[PDB]
């Protein structure tokens with residue numbers, strides 16, 4: 268039903284909220300939830316671990332069957348699979364891991380995948396252990412994505428820093 272509420276409007280198409288993406292998916296019932304994935308779709312940590320545990324591991328079981336038949340994704344690439352109990356679909360997107368020297372320019376490629384979907388619930392890509400500067404990730408999202416994106420950031424200090432920086 269895409270019933271998003273309580274978001275700050277950053278641009279005509281980008282919205283942001285201090286919220287847990289799992290709880291937002293349960294409340295909103297979005298058509299598409301984005302996972303911040305890795306190339307072999309191993310959902311052990313970060314956002315991916317939270318989304319997978321909220322599906323009682325159904326996302327990992329499906330991802331393993333996909334990888335066995337199709338092989339790993341490319342950095343900057345994506346894959347639509349089932350959204351299970353969280354959404355109709357999950358768009359698994361691979362942002363670059365700048366802590367491992369992957370090219371930060373591929374963060375643009377990663378957000379470009381959002382343009383195939385009219386409306387998405389998403390986390391900030393390449394944050395956590397992937398090491399991209401969160402303000403830079405938000406700017407690449409705003410400059411790249413043309414469709415409607417609702418960003419859930421589950422850290423109040425980071426949310427406030429991102430909003431303050433973007434409003435300068």
Ligand SMILES: CCNC(=O)c1cc2c(N[C@H](c3ccc4nc(NC(C)=O)sc4c3)C(C)C)ncnc2[nH]1
Nearest residue numbers: 287288303304313314317392393394395397419421
């Ligand atoms: C209680 C269950 N929920 C959570 O643990 C949870 C966590 C959470 C969340 N975390 C953000 C985050 C953390 C790690 C991380 N690792 C990444 N790696 C790749 C491959 O891109 S991207 C990424 C993003 C923080 C920056 C805020 N963002 C929204 N919703 C959430 N929910």
